[PDB]
Structure formats: structure tokens, C-alpha cells
């Protein structure tokens, strides 16, 4: 009873069952002589991630050094020009008596500034082999199961209901050979490998920043001299470029993805707990009023106030004239465990007027139901 | 002696004068029986500017509040929805027996967050009537500041011992300021198109700050939580690639008419220097095909006229021209700046009289 109330819900009926498990959604299975089960893919977690490239999205300039020279004297030199951590640019300015030079004409200048990153983004490789799928299987009245590419088939034991084999194929997630896991401050995305490698920002693999000029302000030749300044923050520019991209959830270690795990369930060793009991003779009462779900089905809680329990709960969906059985019961053979025991039942009444009968004889509870 | 080192320099000669003053430009005026003057446009400052809009380029989210409700029960409410400092959005989620709802279906939700701006950009309206032009007029051998306003274009400039001049100017500009905005971002300033600036998809205000369209910086997307869009500083710098960067230092050439009627040459009232001269500053060629030299008058009988002549290779006839109008030596050990225009090739610059006269060889490549 975990699938009821979930918006994305698929019903699967087979007569060996084929089912597709996705994030945010869950599958309800039905089969003759087999129990009604709920299946859900809880999480797709990636254990380890290998660092590939680190881009700089925010930078600052420090240790500003300038060297000036008079005309005819040659070009000025700074030791910082040979330093890979600094950005150096040359300009040529009007010199003369007013600027402290004995000679008039164009005098050469050089400015250097230490480049420091304050905001970075990482590109990590996600290995499909290390993926772990958490599947929760619940019976109508949950047991957790793990699917790994190394151990895809798993045996799931259910108390009093038997055992099932869950053979799944971890083929989900777009080819991680062409996909990159991009991290930015607190958010994570799954982007294309080529798109990530083509980003026009300074980058490193190991601090030495390759292509720092991608973060440095553009210089126009026919304009007044300016200081060696850097571009603001590419944080917002990045968020604009990630509009189409799929956002990945990241917590306290590991990354959670949106899987699409294809499974084959073996319902051979499964048995219906309830078939071994006789019909309830006593009176029933409504514990929780019957309510319609988002799947055209109804749910009701019944309290068995009679004796002779454990016993089968008698339920039938009759027509407007209360004669023939017209509806269908989703819950596989519901039982009343003991006296004053509460039972949840999923029903599928037809469109329009119908009568849900719970119990036997005069003591039987008759509930009118309309379906729009 | 202001224009001497300036690269963009123009020489203007008349009788008693049409001149165009531009930023980075320098105008040297010459006239017979009138002093040699330097004119320069210092700044184009608008004394009263009007703020049009302030955009948010960097924001942060705080004090997140959520309120849920069951299906059919209506819409949930929060006190923060009435608060202008808060950004609220509505949606629906799956509700049922497990979520504490008696009914199944989509149940209305509302989420609010405290929006705070940490980085803003301003756009000010530039008006041509409020513009103030600062013109500095210097005499050969500090300068006198003058103000030009469209309301008061003509101005009287008094120069001690040199007389007085009338500076009648008219502001002329190509670009339309009615369609232009002065955009400021942290330390840099730009001149952008009015429509382009008003079309910017960012939160904004006019003039404890209320922000219009906070959702242009705030997303409600989750992989329930409020997400910020991050600094738009770099995105702005990318969009300003074509735009013209500004330093109150607007571009536009001021056309002027100067009245040199009341002007007089300080020096004409003195006699020629008899004593010896020495070079204070060696003679140097400028970027305008002219030369400049500082001379120290070591002799007596000052104030007196400095005797300078540009003679030929054979030291016989006067071949060159002197730019600086009748230079004088104020007192003993006084230094004088002189701008000369020697001809192409060999010439001799003679400073002084008789044997004590200083003879300087000069070769003008050209």
C-alpha cells in the first residue's frame, strides 16, 4: 500500500512479469493466484567520482606591479612576466617633460597582476559500474533490495507471502562515456562531455591555470590605457547555459540520479496469505471512509469486530440493482488477522452507480459509490 | 606649456579666432601682436543627473517558509505573501492517507523566501541642457579655468598681466543623449541604448528596498526549495562588448570663438636682455615638429626680453619661427620656456647678444 497516493503509478497484469521502474513513479503488479505487490525505485546512487577538470568562474587581481620607460630607452621589464601566476599586458603612452621624461614621444609601459580564483567548477566522471539501485517491494496489507551491475539478480524474501527473484538490467542513464557530472557550489548537473571541454574559461587538471586570458578584460587598441582587470562572475552565465541540462541531487556523499531500471520478476515461489483461511462470519465496520485515488481506484480501511479470525474479508462490487458482480478488487484476497483488526482494500468500481458489500448476510455493510 | 607633450595637438593661426576643442586634444593659438595661448577641454560634467532604474545582478535567499494543504481544502496562506521583501510561488503535490490527508489528489502548496540584493547596477538619464564644459586656458611661460554651460555659453577670462579674452562656445554632439543611458556597474561605467537597458531581464527598482520581478533571479526548480540564479556580473560584461566605456567624462567636441581684442603681450613693455643665458633644460623635439627649451637668465637688468633667433647653416639669415610670443626673463636666475619651429635639416638657435650669446646646433630629421 505504498503506491496508492503516488501520482505517477502504472498497473501491470501478466499471465515472469515485465516491468519498468522509474524515479518519482511506482508499479503495482497483479496476477491470478499471486499477491498484489507495489514496486518502487527509491534511489540510483553513484559511490565514487573521478575529478577530470576544474574551471575558474570567479577571479581577482592582487600584487599589481608597473614598470615605465622613457622614449628611445627601450621596453621596460618585470620578473613577474616570467611568472605563470601573473597576467602581463604592454601599452605605449605619450611621454614628455610633464611626465618626467627628458625626451618626448611614445614611452613603453608594462603592468602585471597575480591571478587568483575565488569560484571554481568541477567536472567529474561517473563510472556506470559503481551504480547502486535501491528497489522497495511492498505487499498490500516494505522489503529493500539492491541492484548492482555486478549482482543484478536478487532474491527477495517476504514473510508469509513467499519469495521472488528480481532480475534487472542496469542500462539506464545516457552513455556516461559521453556524459560529465558538473558541480557548481551546491548544485550538480549531468552535461555532455564535449560541451564541458569546450567551455571558454581558465582550467586545471591538478595551482597553474591554463588560458587565464579567458577571464581577463578585452583590450581595444584605439582607446585610453586601463589597469589589468578581470571579468566579474560567470556563475549566472553558467546557470543560463544549463537551462536544458538535467539537474542531479547531491547530499552528504554520493550522487542521486533519475533512473529507468528495466526488471523481470519471478512470481513462481509467491503465495497469497489469506487463501489458507475461511470466510469471515462476523460484522465489519468502516475504520476509514472510502476515498477515490488519482488512478480511478478506491481505498477503504475495515475493522473486523466479529470472531473466528484469521479469516478472509468478503468484498464484492455489485451493480445499481445490487444483483451481479460488476467491479474488480485490486487487493489480493484481503484477510482479518485477529479481532478488532484493520484491513486496507484497493477496489476498482465501474463508472457511475455501484454498491460495495463488505460482510455476509444481514450484518453485511453496503456502501453506495459514484464514479465520475 | 600644456599641449607640448599631448599627442593630439592642433595649431591655429589668425589675426584677432575659430577653434574646435576635443577630449584628448589640445589647441595652440597664434596671432601677430597677441600672446601664444594653449586651450584644452578638461571635462564634460553633468551637475544634475536623474536615476531611471536600479537592477539587481547578485542576490541571496533566506528564511524559507512553506505551507501545505489537502486536496479540495483550498489554497494555503502565509503572512510572508503580504511582505514585499519576500518572493512567493504556488504549486500542487500528491496528497493522500499517508501524507495525513483524508482525500487523495493534488494539494496546493506555497513557498516564500527573503530576497536580498548584494550587487546592483544603476542607469542614469543624461540631459544635454545640464552639461558643464571645463576649459583650461594657459599662457606660454598653472592656467585659468573657465565654465561653458548651454545657458551661459559666453564667458570672460581674465589673465594676469596678459589682459582679457571672451570665450563664446556652442556645444556640438553627434550621438542622441535622449536615446542614451549612463550605466554604472561597481567601478566601470558605460553609455548604452535606453531601450536595451530597459529591456534587461533582471529584478529592478525606481530611485528597506522593494524589488520588482524577483523571479528573474529566483528559481523554484529542485532536482521543495528556493534557488538563487548567481552573479550576472560576467553575463553583463559579455553583453557590453560592443558598448562604449566611459570614465562624468562624456565625449563631444566643443566649438569655440575666442575674442583676442583685450589681449596684450607681457614682454613688449621690456627692453632686450644684455646678460648671459644658460640651458636649464636641454632642447628636445616634440611630436609636432617643434622644439622646446628652458633657459636660465644669469645676467642683470631683468625684467627683460629674451633674444632668440633661428639662423641657417651659415649662421647668417633668420630661417625658422618662434611659437612662444616675446619670451621674457622675470628676474635674475629666472627660468623661461620657449617653443621653436626650426626648419628641416641644419640650423643654429642663438640665445643672447654678442660673445655671451649661446649657440645651439639643431638637426631636424625630415
Amino acid at each position, epitope marked *: 500500500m505504498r503506491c496508492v497516493g503516488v501520482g505517477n503509478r502504472d498497473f501491470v497484469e501478466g499471465v515472469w512479469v515485465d516491468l519498468v521502474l522509474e524515479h518519482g513513479g511506482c508499479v503495482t503488479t497483479m496476477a491470478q493466484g499471486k499477491p498484489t505487490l507495489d514496486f518502487e525505485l527509491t534511489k540510483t546512487t553513484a559511490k565514487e567520482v573521478a575529478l577530470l577538470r576544474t574551471y575558474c568562474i570567479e577571479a581577482s587581481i592582487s600584487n*599589481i*606591479t*608597473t*614598470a*615605465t*620607460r*622613457c622614449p628611445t*630607452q627601450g621596453e*621596460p621589464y618585470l620578473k613577474e612576466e616570467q611568472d605563470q601566476q601573473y597576467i602581463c599586458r604592454r601599452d605605449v*603612452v605619450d611621454r614628455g*617633460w*610633464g*611626465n*618626467g*621624461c*627628458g625626451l618626448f614621444g611614445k614611452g613603453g609601459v608594462v603592468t602585471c597582476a597575480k591571478f587568483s580564483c575565488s569560484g571554481k567548477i568541477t567536472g567529474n566522471l561517473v563510472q556506470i559500474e559503481n551504480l547502486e539501485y535501491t528497489v522497495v517491494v511492498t505487499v498490500h496489507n516494505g522489503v529493500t533490495a539492491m541492484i548492482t551491475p555486478r549482482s543484478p539478480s536478487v532474491e527477495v524474501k517476504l514473510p508469509d507471502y513467499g519469495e521472488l527473484t528480481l532480475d534487472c538490467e542496469p542500462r539506464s542513464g545516457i552513455d556516461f562515456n559521453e556524459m560529465i557530472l558538473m558541480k557548481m557550489k551546491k548544485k550538480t548537473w549531468l552535461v555532455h562531455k564535449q560541451w564541458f571541454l569546450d567551455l571558454p574559461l581558465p582550467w586545471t587538471a591538478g595551482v597553474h591555470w591554463n588560458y587565464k586570458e579567458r577571464m581577463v578584460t578585452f583590450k581595444v587598441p584605439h582607446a*585610453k*590605457r586601463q589597469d589589468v582587470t578581470v571579468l566579474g562572475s560567470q556563475e549566472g552565465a553558467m546557470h543560463s547555459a544549463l537551462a536544458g541540462a538535467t539537474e542531479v541531487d547531491s547530499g552528504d556523499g554520493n550522487h542521486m540520479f533519475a533512473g529507468h531500471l528495466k526488471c523481470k520478476v519471478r512470481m513462481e515461489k509467491l503465495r497469497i496469505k489469506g487463501m489458507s483461511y475461511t470466510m469471515c462470519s462476523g460484522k465489519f465496520s468502516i475504520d476509514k471512509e472510502m476515498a477515490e485515488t488519482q488512478h480511478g481506484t478506491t481505498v477503504v480501511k475495515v475493522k473486523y469486530e466479529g470472531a473466528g479470525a484469521p479469516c478472509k474479508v468478503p468484498i464484492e462490487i455489485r451493480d445499481v440493482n445490487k444483483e451481479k458482480v460488476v467491479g474488480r478488487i485490486i487487493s489480493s484476497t484481503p484477510l482479518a488477522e485477529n479481532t478488532n483488526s484493520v484491513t486496507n482494500i484497493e477496489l476498482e468500481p465501474p463508472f457511475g452507480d455501484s454498491y460495495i458489500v463488505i460482510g455476509v448476510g444481514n450484518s453485511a455493510l453496503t456502501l453506495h459509490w459514484f464514479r465520475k | 606649456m600644456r599641449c607640448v607633450g599631448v599627442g593630439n595637438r592642433d595649431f591655429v593661426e589668425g589675426v584677432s579666432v575659430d577653434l574646435v576643442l576635443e577630449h584628448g586634444g589640445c589647441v595652440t593659438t597664434m596671432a601677430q601682436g597677441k600672446p601664444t595661448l594653449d586651450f*584644452e577641454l*578638461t*571635462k564634460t560634467t553633468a551637475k544634475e543627473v536623474a536615476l531611471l532604474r536600479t537592477y539587481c545582478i547578485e542576490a541571496s535567499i533566506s528564511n524559507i517558509t512553506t505551507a501545505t494543504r489537502c486536496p479540495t481544502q483550498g489554497e494555503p496562506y502565509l503572512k510572508e505573501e503580504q511582505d514585499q521583501q519576500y518572493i512567493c510561488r504556488r504549486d500542487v503535490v500528491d496528497r493522500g492517507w499517508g501524507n495525513g490527508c483524508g482525500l487523495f489528489g493534488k494539494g496546493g502548496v506555497v513557498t516564500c523566501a527573503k530576497f536580498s540584493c548584494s550587487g546592483k547596477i544603476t542607469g542614469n538619464l543624461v540631459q544635454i541642457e545640464n552639461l558643464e564644459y571645463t576649459v*583650461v586656458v594657459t599662457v606660454h611661460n598653472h592656467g585659468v579655468t573657465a565654465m561653458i554651460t548651454p545657458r551661459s555659453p559666453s564667458v570672460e577670462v581674465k589673465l594676469p598681466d596678459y589682459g582679457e579674452l571672451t570665450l563664446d562656445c556652442e556645444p556640438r554632439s553627434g550621438i542622441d543623449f535622449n536615446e542614451m543611458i549612463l550605466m554604472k556597474m561597481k567601478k566601470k561605467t558605460w553609455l548604452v541604448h535606453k531601450q536595451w537597458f530597459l529591456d534587461l531581464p533582471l529584478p529592478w527598482t525606481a530611485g528597506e528596498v522593494h524589488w520588482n520581478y524577483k523571479e528573474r533571479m529566483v528559481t523554484f526548480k529542485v532536482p521543495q526549495d528556493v534557488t538563487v540564479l548567481g552573479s550576472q556580473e560576467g553575463a553583463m560584461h559579455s553583453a557590453l562588448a560592443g558598448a562604449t566605456e566611459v*570614465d562624468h*567624462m562624456f565625449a563631444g567636441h566643443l566649438k569655440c570663438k575666442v575674442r583676442m581684442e583685450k589681449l596684450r603681450i607681457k614682454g613688449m613693455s621690456y627692453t632686450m636682455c644684455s646678460g648671459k643665458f644658460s640651458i*636649464d*633644460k636641454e632642447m628636445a623635439e616634440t611630436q609636432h615638429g617643434t622644439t622646446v627649451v*628652458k633657459v*636660465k637668465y644669469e645676467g642683470a637688468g631683468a625684467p627683460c626680453k629674451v633674444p632668440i633667433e633661428i639662423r641657417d647653416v651659415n649662421k647668417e639669415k633668420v630661417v625658422g619661427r618662434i611659437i612662444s610670443s616675446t619670451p621674457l626673463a622675470e628676474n*635674475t*636666475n629666472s*627660468v623661461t620656456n620657449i617653443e621653436l619651429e626650426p626648419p628641416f635639416g641644419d640650423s643654429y638657435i642663438v640665445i643672447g647678444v654678442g660673445n655671451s650669446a649661446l649657440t645651439l646646433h639643431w638637426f631636424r630629421k625630415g
Partner: antibody
Amino acid sequence: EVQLVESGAEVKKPGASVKVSCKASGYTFTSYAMHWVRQAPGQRLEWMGWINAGNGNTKYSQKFQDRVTITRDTSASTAYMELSSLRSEDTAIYYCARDKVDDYGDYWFPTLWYFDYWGQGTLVTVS
Amino acid sequence: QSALTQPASVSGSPGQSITISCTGTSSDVGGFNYVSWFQQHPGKAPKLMLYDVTSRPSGVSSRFSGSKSGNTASLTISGLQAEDEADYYCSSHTSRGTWVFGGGTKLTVL
């Protein structure tokens, strides 16, 4: 006329910070740069740095870049100089000197007649 | 240590002439004309005596003269007076855009 009024003498303990000032009078503060030069008793003058009062840009000496912070108040025509993590060697007289900025606002090259007007200097004593 | 070298003490007789040297490098004194001379009386702030190597402010006497040859700058005081007895510093704007001061010279008048 032109005058630079310096702040009063201060006695500080080692490991603390000290903030000295200079108020400009008789000239346009925005058009000039404020320099800071120190002099220990019986020692030479030592240049610390400057502030362009027009745009707020600075330049410090390599010996003072980590400890010295120069600020300005355009409204009050006052220039401030803060020296953090004081030591017994910082016991000196702190002089302020003016120099005109270029007409365009940028202080690339100083004027030929730099430090034409000085402040009387503030004696900062470190015990 | 100052980048500019000045003699610590220079003595002279009244009415006589005297010269104070200031040796720098090609990066300051030998490179630019930003060579200035300052007079500092005991207890008083420095006073600009010479700028642009040779130029002098309005109130400064003609007795004070400046010179430059290579990386060495010179200050000449003609006809010494008792009031001339003060500390003299030379300064220079450098290639790096900084300012350097000399060690100083204490002028003693006999």
C-alpha cells in the same frame, strides 16, 4: 589658502591598530592625491603609499601593502591612514603630502612638483 | 635601506657655497626628471625646495640650485646662512611608480 590639518598624537600598545587623518583646506580634494610618508625619531623619511581622492584608487609600498590601508572621505575632505598589527618599530611621525591628479581622473604619472604642501605630522608612539 | 645615497653630514662656513650629492639608479634618478629636494628643520615638516631637478617654488631662494649627471643628483646652496642649518632629503619617482627618499644629510653651519 592651502592647509593640511593632521590628527593628534596617539599612544598605542603593540599588536593593535592605529588610524591617522589629514583634512584638506583651501583646495578641491577630489582633484588631488593624498600621500603618506613616515619618519622614525632621528631616521630618514620613508614613503608608504597614496590615495586618489577622486576615484578611491590606491598604491602602497611593498613594506606596507599587508599592514597599511589608506581611505578617504570626500564629504569631509579628510584622508585616513590605518596601520594594523603595530610593532615597536612603527614608533614614527606620520606626514601627509598632496600631489595633483591628471584632469581625466587617472593618477598614472605624478605632477613634477609633488609634495608641495605637507601636514605637520602625527606622532604615533608604540610601547 | 634607502635606494638613494646621500652623505650623512655636510659642514660649511657662512657665506661659502656647498654641494649635497644624491646617488640613485637608472630606475629613478638616472631615468626620470622626478628628482626633488626637501628641507626639514628640527620639529618641522619637510619643505619643497626643488622639483624637476632644477625648478624651484615661488618662495624658494635663488641660492638653492639643482643639477643631475647620470644616476647622481646635486643640490647647491650658495652663500650659506645660519637658518640653512637643517636636514636635506632628495626624492625620486621610480620606474615602478613608487617614491624613494634619500638617507638624509644634516647640514651644519659654522
